[PDB]
């Protein structure tokens, strides 16, 4: 039934946020691994 | 008799409706896994 | 006699339609589980 | 749920600090080598 | 954790020292290298 | 005589409906034994 | 005769509601089956 | 009857807490086998 | 039941120690690759 | 259990002190490289 | 194990002596690149 | 006569519960063989 | 009778316990194929 | 009875120690997948 | 049984044996590849 | 088993011969390169 | 096999003449340079 | 009569025993079943 | 009667031994397919 | 009967040599990669 | 059987060559691609 | 198959042409390139 | 295919015009260099 | 009478043979089932 | 009778062949779908 | 029947073709994947 | 059947040039990289 | 499809351009670079 | 896209200015060491 | 009477030949599942 | 009778095309997921 | 029935549409990955 | 459907417009790398 | 989404002051050098 | 961060003294060359 479908969705969206709020926080390390280490390039 | 067929259907699609809100929901997660992710590569 | 056999007929056919109308309906379900699953693949 | 999400962030940051408390560790290595460098130059 | 930055530190520091007193060792040869050059000149 | 015959044909349809009135409820359990178990799937 | 059909009737939508009932409590796990697992894939 | 219904489902939400609770029991690797391999990394 | 969760759980988390010390192991080898490769460098 | 990680540990120590032995050995050559070199150089 | 150590080293050392072999050979030629060189400059 | 019918009914339902009462029991079982097995899974 | 049913239950919760039992038993090894296992990804 | 589940029992663990004794024992592999492998690295 | 262990066992070292006989022969040829390449350098 | 072990070694050994023999060939080139380039030198 | 290493060499032996033969070519050009050069100075 | 009764009882139980002891010989066989088919997949 | 048990027994042993002898002669097979296929890795 | 299990043997002991027989034929393959491609490694 | 062995070895080998042949002739480029290279150098 | 073979092959000779041809084209500008810059020097 | 090589061939020989364009361009500077000096001489 | 009993007997066993001849003759296809299946997996 | 047995054999045998016939006709395959993709992989 | 084996045959084979004709036509794409990056190289 | 092979190829010709065609509209840009930067060089 | 050729050429082209025009710009820089460096000359 | 190209030219200007009004600065040294040692001349 | 045999016997067989023509028309269909599917696979 | 034979064929034969006709339609997928992504790969 | 089959297709190619549609929106990203990537690059 | 199709692109698109803006960022950097390092070279 | 670049963004800009900060702190370094070195010079 | 950016600064200004602090001391030697120099030439 319908029950099924806006209630598979309901969840659906609720889950996204979940995903991408833990990638944001994981860039940040990125975003960490490009300070650490452009410079030590400067050196040499 | 008919009975049995047009009212099978008459589920049949009603699901489908379902199954494929269900369906989209979840891939705004794959949309997403690929948000958290692509952003790491852009740093190494 | 004959009245058992080609009646028996007149509803061994008529609900044939029945079933393969239900069989339709319910593969367009499949068809829309390929809908929702090609999708995540392509993200990962 | 939410509960995926606002922890799986929790980790994401507190990770971050342990990522860039590395990278500075090891460019003051980068300085260093420039120290043991620049010098040999004035020399020659 | 913080168990890894801390201790990626205590490292990244101890490291230095050692690049460092490697640094030097090399630079008392160019001071050297310049012994034995600024010598030729004051001939010719 | 006719009076058996017309007399069992009189119930023998009346409790036909009896018969498919009841079916048409069970099924509608087949079909949500799909509805709980297509979802199941979904996750794995 | 009606007696046996509507009332066969009356159990088989009243158990409906139960059979599905079950199924949505289920399903609340498929949904956390993939709380825990997509989450560990984000390491690797 | 209402019995198996309401009664399957305290069952399927109790269990539900139990895979979930698993589920963040495992993560916690992940994010180590994490914390032990981003350091090797670092290095090379 | 709360039977297989919170003793799902001890283990998921006696299992990480188990992970994380195996990890810290490994590291000390990347520490220690970039012992035997810095040097190298140095001369060239 | 505990058996993994104090047992993944004693040998992820004792492959340290090979890695390094090895890194020593490689290193000498670094420094008679610059033998061999260091020598051209005073001619010109 | 120590196997890789130990074994790694007895090559290590091995080959320095050939780096070096070769490094003197090459010296002898800049020796006599001041053979050829000195003699020039002492007619104008 | 009478004393039939509203005596065999008497036991009809009477004998209900004993059958329901049997069912329940078993069903913690499949409950449970749901417990054992979630979990192989979860590991591979 | 009560007879019957009561004491249909006396067993049906009496064999549970065995059911678990098992199960547990079982998931051990789940466990410990995840020993075996995580371990040798560590080195590839 | 309790015969069931105490007895399956006497195995479940019984065969733990299997399991984990054959998994130990291929992991000695992975470590010397990464004896040959290390050393080919080190050299390019 | 015992008998799967310790068979299993029997076995996951005698490979081992394998392994890594296998991994000495192939980093041979890395000693080489690093005989035929800090050859060329030495003259350019 | 052995089968694999002496049988991957004796390929092992048998492939250096090539890598060094090739190795050997393409020396002789960096040999003939300070060939062509010493003696544009001594010119200017 | 050999196939590789005979063959390897079949050809870093046929490419030295190569390299060699344009080596000879460039220096007679450095010997013109000294042509065109040690002329201009005895006018001075 | 009581006698039979008593006596169909007598034999009742005396059954069981058979029935259960022919049970476990049995799943002794499952047991193995899972012995000689746990360990073809820790190969793949 | 026990003449049932015990006799249903004396076979329920004795072929678990055939199918235990037939479960190692297969799995020696596995450890063959990891025979063949650990080598392939090692090339790429 | 023992006729299941020696025979059930004699068949899985049989295979084994089947399989390792193509094993070791596709390896020769594996050891050709290598062949062909440390080549093209060489040049660049 | 016998059959699947020598047979699954009688293309094994008869692929080998085929892989060989192919990568000679891409080595021929590697070759030709250190042709077009060591040129450019020896005019800067 | 051969197929595979002797055609990879008649490839891998084509393209060689292909590469060489390119080669040749490009180290004409390194002939031009020392035609540009001899001449400068020629002046200070 | 040729398609790349003459064709790669097309633009390295349209470039070196280019390249060579370039390079008379800038030796008019060295002639003139050789103006504005010669002259200063001439006075001292 | 001992008749049908001694009797019945000389036919229980005299039909096993013929039941467990018809097996043996079956299983030989199952493991050539696995004959052209266990090739299959190989190339892929 | 041994009717049945021998004669059930019969068939059981000359099946066989024909399974194993069509296996080995699908292996070429595999060892075909092997040939179109070694091939890919070598370009990249 | 022997109708199954050499008919199943007759397919096998007359598949392969199809398997192989394939394979062929996307090998030429690896081809040119070659094709278009050897290129872009020989720039940089 | 055929119509799989030679409906395949059909494809595999087709993509190719698509394939080729997109690369030589990426190496154009190589040729200009080369453009932009030999120009910078000529300067220094 | 051609649908992927000529649209990923329209692109490959329409990169080249925006390539190049960075090129220039970049290369009016070492022109002068090229203008403060030859006036620094002429004073010495 | 042209997005590319038009700025990274805005920058490529922007940036020459840059360089060339830090070029006339060092210049004016060139001017002044010249005033410095045209002088010291005069006197000898 | 034979009358009986002989004559259940000519039906028997006839009804084989009806067996076996359905069963081959059924297998061209999984022949052609096979034809849809290994096509998928190749591209992925 | 050959009436359930050549009938069951007449279907057998007529659903192939159907299956295969569908498969066909499946496939153009296929080869567009390659078409989505080997574009990808050309950019990174 | 032709029902199933030109009805399976109706869908399999609409379907490609999409898949392909959805490959080309994707691949606009690659072609802006390189778009912030040859930038850099040109840096350096 | 198109439903997937217009409505996958609708993304596509919106998420190259956050690659792109991303990259543009990242490039400023690079822009400044050339600051930083021009500036150095310009005294020595 | 845009939340991916308008934010990524944010990052790139402010990483950059950071990059060219530390760009200026090292020049001051070159500035210095040549005020170390031009002083040499005006002696000799 | 900033953090990267006043703290590569904090260090960048910091060095400067350490270069221009070790230039004085050499230019105390050019100074005193001057001082053995000038001497020289008043006799003659």
Same mark, same amino acid.
Do not use: E, N, Y
């Given at each position: 039934?319908?029950?099924? &479908?806006?209630?598979?969705?309901?969840? !659906?969206? /609720? @889950?996204?946020?979940? +995903?991408?709020? &833990?990638?944001?926080?994981?860039?940040? !390390?990125? /975003? @960490?691994?490009?300070? +650490?280490?452009? &410079?030590?390039?400067?050196?040499?």
């Amino acid at each position: 039934m319908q029950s099924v &479908i806006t209630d598979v969705t309901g969840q !659906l969206t /609720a @889950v996204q946020a979940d +995903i991408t709020t &833990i990638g944001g926080a994981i860039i940040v !390390l990125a /975003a @960490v691994v490009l300070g +650490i280490r452009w &410079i030590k390039a400067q050196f040499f």
